[PDB]
Amino acid sequence: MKVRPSVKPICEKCKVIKRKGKVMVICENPKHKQRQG
Amino acid sequence: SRVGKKIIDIPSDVTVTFDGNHVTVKGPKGELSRTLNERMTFKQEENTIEVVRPSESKEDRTNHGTTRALLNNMVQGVSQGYVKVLELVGVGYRAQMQGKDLILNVGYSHPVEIKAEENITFSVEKNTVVKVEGISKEQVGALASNIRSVRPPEPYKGKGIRYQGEYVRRKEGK
Amino acid sequence: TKGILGRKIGMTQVFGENGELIPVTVVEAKENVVLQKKTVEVDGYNAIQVGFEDKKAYKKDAKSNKYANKPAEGHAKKADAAPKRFIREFRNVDVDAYEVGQEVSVDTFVAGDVIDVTGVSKGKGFQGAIKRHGQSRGPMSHGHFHRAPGSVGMASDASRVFKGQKMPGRMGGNTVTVQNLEVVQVDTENKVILVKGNVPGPKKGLVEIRTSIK
Amino acid sequence: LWITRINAAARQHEMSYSRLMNGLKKAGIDINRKMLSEIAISDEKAFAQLVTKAKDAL
Amino acid sequence: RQTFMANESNIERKWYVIDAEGQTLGRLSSEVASILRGKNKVTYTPHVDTGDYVIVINASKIEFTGNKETDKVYYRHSNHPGGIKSITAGELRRTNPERLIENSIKGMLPSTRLGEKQGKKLFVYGGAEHPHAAQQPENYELR
RNA sequence: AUAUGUUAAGUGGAAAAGGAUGUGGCGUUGCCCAGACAACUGGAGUGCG
RNA sequence: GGUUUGGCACCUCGAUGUCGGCUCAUCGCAUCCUGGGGCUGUAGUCGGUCCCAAGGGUUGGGCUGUUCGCCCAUUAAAGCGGUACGCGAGCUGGGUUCAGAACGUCGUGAGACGUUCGGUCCCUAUCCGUCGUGGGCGUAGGAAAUUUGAGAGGAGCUGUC
RNA sequence: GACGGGAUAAGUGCUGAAAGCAUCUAAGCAUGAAGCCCCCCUCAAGAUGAGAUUUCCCAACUUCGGUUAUAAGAUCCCUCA
């Protein structure tokens, strides 16, 4: 996945949720996984 | 908290006892499911249970959705059935049953053998469909993933254990 | 599971039945007696206690450590043995041994091929930074650093020598064990084990031949 | 040191030190003295009536 | 002039046993490090050993608030190079609960010629029993 | 000690552009009883292979 | 971030005396190898990126005083940095920077700044530190043996068939 | 330098609300590395918190309230590894 310090929704299928105090982006695609928000 | 509103709707064939701060459930399929309710009030008048919710500070609101979706899945758990079917894909794969321990010829140099639990049921269809009947919702949930994690499904030829009702991904290997 | 005590004799070689050639160690094992049995009923652990190569009894003008004194004779009276010279102690055994003194048989290692031999060492005493630790030495033609250690530390940002450098001192004498040796041939009427390969000690030493853990 | 002994005298009568050298400036005009924590060591019956007079007008 | 100095045969030091269950770690160790120094009594002087012997039972039920059970660590060193060793306060409750309280108290004791003798009036036990019944303690309701 | 509210990271007890359904206060709007938003059953129109 | 080239002139001119390689280390993670994963424009073998990870390992030579460097044969890999650009009361003195001499060049002149051949490297360890090994007294009587292990050290790699 | 065992990191999870759905989490649960704590080898009770188990020696005095000696045990001395 993409470990970058700016998470941002790219398309409409991608949602934002915080797990263990980290803003993550989980999505149906495998290329749109993002953390470290 | 609209999940914190619906009733349990005990169908008048179900045993529910508030053993202090526990719940002991006996039913016509599986009995003696024990659990915990931390501080929510349960008024259990005549075959229905309404949960009284305290005030603000979401600690008193997050646990109000949980502690009445934990018992709603036991009253409708000791009677009803479960989504539990598991399907294999590929050539030369077979799900062979040996007693109550499943052995999966899955494409290795060693066959993988799984062990069972208490109040749960393994059953195998024709060659390659593996059911897991149970009464604990975590036990049927875990052992549908302890089986699946032997070989997760591929994005190329589909081979490996999957569920029934979910689409795996496809590509072109060129 | 248990072991015996042994006095090293020497090294020669036997031949295998297939055509091989085994270098072997002659370890004799004379009179061995279980002197007590430390249990968890009384204070402590679970163990037994063997002796080896008994001494003489007692004398009024007892001059040296040939004769047994009064404290180390009543200890070898309850277990009704002669006073033994080298007393050691073995854990991780059964309770097949009696607390009263029965003799430990050399006929219990007839094919047990997992053997730890726990000797002392030969005790060289020849000190030195090269021969103790296997360090290198400088050029004996161009420069000067013929046999010596070098920097004992880094420099003035430390300004100390770290505990555990490598300096001269008395080499040899530390107890070592060797693991997973095998047994070739046991004997009666000589009470000799033939344990394969070298053992850690001088001649007329003392070894402790116990069954391996790995 | 004198303040340490007085503080370890009023806490057994369930009062602070800072509640004790408050009342004895305000209830009475008991003159400010801390070397005369010798009363608390010597005569506990003498030290008790001061604690009565401090609570009385505070 | 008129001051008092309590000395080696002018005082007694009686025993206290304190149930250390159901209360936190550093809120307990202040009503122990002041009993060992003797600030519950008048005729407190410096430079002598006043105070009371303190016994602690139920070391297994002390508390922590927040993630101190996983993010409080106890670094120690060993004077060889590269020797720092780490141990957390969640595995120290279960393994050796006799040491955990005994260093929560001895960090609060003075300069260490007499503060070594004050600290050794403290007996820390893990269970609910103690072999000091021959010394006649009593329960101390600490605030 | 006291009367009141805030913080859940050991922040307090090292520093930025940017990101963020963390949470508390003060205002403003548009839909909502024809019951509304969400799920839930059968017009060249929003991504797709 | 504080390793490069620098800026300031605060510490040492009654001494802080300067480069690389031998001998022996030791630490950091911004990881070269090995261990576990996530995407992949990943069919399979090979790869590419990014995140957790310091436990061990990290070759032998030719040319240069060499720092960099370039090449040759391998190997699982031939990591980048700090410790007075680690270490000269441990070694080297080839180098840089002494007196002799020569060229090129500049100077009317004594002489001078790029190369060249030669050119003394001192010390018996008082205290802290480290590696070994013995006396004294203490553990409430005085002695002979055998041991629990609080803690602290050691080891940790991997090829090919 | 073996093979294990217990707790974890990145990650993969199951049930589940805040937020009728969705959701690896906030309450509860599984799994997971040559790394961490043990396992294996060595030193270690001066660990002044100075531990433990077996065994040996135990009287004649004096008012000196405590001694002088012997016991069990080691040692100087000589023949040596």
TrEMBL record, chain A:
<dbReference type="GO" id="GO:1990904">
    <property type="term" value="C:ribonucleoprotein complex"/>
</dbReference>
<feature type="binding site">
    <location>
        <position position="27"/>
    </location>
    <ligand>
        <name>Zn(2+)</name>
    </ligand>
</feature>
<dbReference type="GO" id="GO:0006412">
    <property type="term" value="P:translation"/>
</dbReference>
<dbReference type="GO" id="GO:0003735">
    <property type="term" value="F:structural constituent of ribosome"/>
</dbReference>
<keyword id="KW-0862">Zinc</keyword>
<feature type="binding site">
    <location>
        <position position="14"/>
    </location>
    <ligand>
        <name>Zn(2+)</name>
    </ligand>
</feature>
<dbReference type="InterPro" id="IPR000473">
    <property type="entry name" value="Ribosomal_bL36"/>
</dbReference>
<dbReference type="GO" id="GO:0005840">
    <property type="term" value="C:ribosome"/>
</dbReference>
<feature type="binding site">
    <location>
        <position position="11"/>
    </location>
    <ligand>
        <name>Zn(2+)</name>
    </ligand>
</feature>
<dbReference type="GO" id="GO:0005737">
    <property type="term" value="C:cytoplasm"/>
</dbReference>
<protein>
    <recommendedName>
        <fullName>Large ribosomal subunit protein bL36</fullName>
    </recommendedName>
</protein>
<keyword id="KW-0687">Ribonucleoprotein</keyword>
TrEMBL record, chain B:
<protein>
    <recommendedName>
        <fullName>Large ribosomal subunit protein uL6</fullName>
    </recommendedName>
</protein>
<dbReference type="GO" id="GO:0003735">
    <property type="term" value="F:structural constituent of ribosome"/>
</dbReference>
<feature type="domain" description="Large ribosomal subunit protein uL6 alpha-beta">
    <location>
        <begin position="89"/>
        <end position="163"/>
    </location>
</feature>
<dbReference type="InterPro" id="IPR000702">
    <property type="entry name" value="Ribosomal_uL6-like"/>
</dbReference>
<dbReference type="GO" id="GO:0002181">
    <property type="term" value="P:cytoplasmic translation"/>
</dbReference>
<dbReference type="InterPro" id="IPR019906">
    <property type="entry name" value="Ribosomal_uL6_bac-type"/>
</dbReference>
<dbReference type="GO" id="GO:0019843">
    <property type="term" value="F:rRNA binding"/>
</dbReference>
<comment type="function">
    <text>This protein binds to the 23S rRNA, and is important in its secondary structure. It is located near the subunit interface in the base of the L7/L12 stalk, and near the tRNA binding site of the peptidyltransferase center.</text>
</comment>
<comment type="subunit">
    <text>Part of the 50S ribosomal subunit.</text>
</comment>
<dbReference type="InterPro" id="IPR002358">
    <property type="entry name" value="Ribosomal_uL6_CS"/>
</dbReference>
<dbReference type="GO" id="GO:0022625">
    <property type="term" value="C:cytosolic large ribosomal subunit"/>
</dbReference>
<keyword id="KW-0689">Ribosomal protein</keyword>
From TrEMBL, chain C:
<protein>
    <recommendedName>
        <fullName>Large ribosomal subunit protein uL3</fullName>
    </recommendedName>
</protein>
<comment type="similarity">
    <text>Belongs to the universal ribosomal protein uL3 family.</text>
</comment>
<dbReference type="InterPro" id="IPR009000">
    <property type="entry name" value="Transl_B-barrel_sf"/>
</dbReference>
<dbReference type="GO" id="GO:0006412">
    <property type="term" value="P:translation"/>
</dbReference>
<keyword id="KW-0479">Metal-binding</keyword>
<dbReference type="InterPro" id="IPR000597">
    <property type="entry name" value="Ribosomal_uL3"/>
</dbReference>
<dbReference type="InterPro" id="IPR019927">
    <property type="entry name" value="Ribosomal_uL3_bac/org-type"/>
</dbReference>
<keyword id="KW-0689">Ribosomal protein</keyword>
<comment type="subunit">
    <text>Part of the 50S ribosomal subunit. Forms a cluster with proteins L14 and L19.</text>
</comment>
<dbReference type="InterPro" id="IPR019926">
    <property type="entry name" value="Ribosomal_uL3_CS"/>
</dbReference>
<comment type="function">
    <text>One of the primary rRNA binding proteins, it binds directly near the 3'-end of the 23S rRNA, where it nucleates assembly of the 50S subunit.</text>
</comment>
<dbReference type="GO" id="GO:0003735">
    <property type="term" value="F:structural constituent of ribosome"/>
</dbReference>
From TrEMBL, chain E:
<dbReference type="InterPro" id="IPR005823">
    <property type="entry name" value="Ribosomal_uL13_bac-type"/>
</dbReference>
<dbReference type="GO" id="GO:0006412">
    <property type="term" value="P:translation"/>
</dbReference>
<keyword id="KW-0687">Ribonucleoprotein</keyword>
<dbReference type="GO" id="GO:0017148">
    <property type="term" value="P:negative regulation of translation"/>
</dbReference>
<dbReference type="Pfam" id="PF00572">
    <property type="entry name" value="Ribosomal_L13"/>
</dbReference>
<comment type="similarity">
    <text>Belongs to the universal ribosomal protein uL13 family.</text>
</comment>
<dbReference type="GO" id="GO:0022625">
    <property type="term" value="C:cytosolic large ribosomal subunit"/>
</dbReference>
<dbReference type="GO" id="GO:0003729">
    <property type="term" value="F:mRNA binding"/>
</dbReference>
<comment type="subunit">
    <text>Part of the 50S ribosomal subunit.</text>
</comment>
<comment type="function">
    <text>This protein is one of the early assembly proteins of the 50S ribosomal subunit, although it is not seen to bind rRNA by itself. It is important during the early stages of 50S assembly.</text>
</comment>
<dbReference type="InterPro" id="IPR023563">
    <property type="entry name" value="Ribosomal_uL13_CS"/>
</dbReference>
<dbReference type="InterPro" id="IPR036899">
    <property type="entry name" value="Ribosomal_uL13_sf"/>
</dbReference>
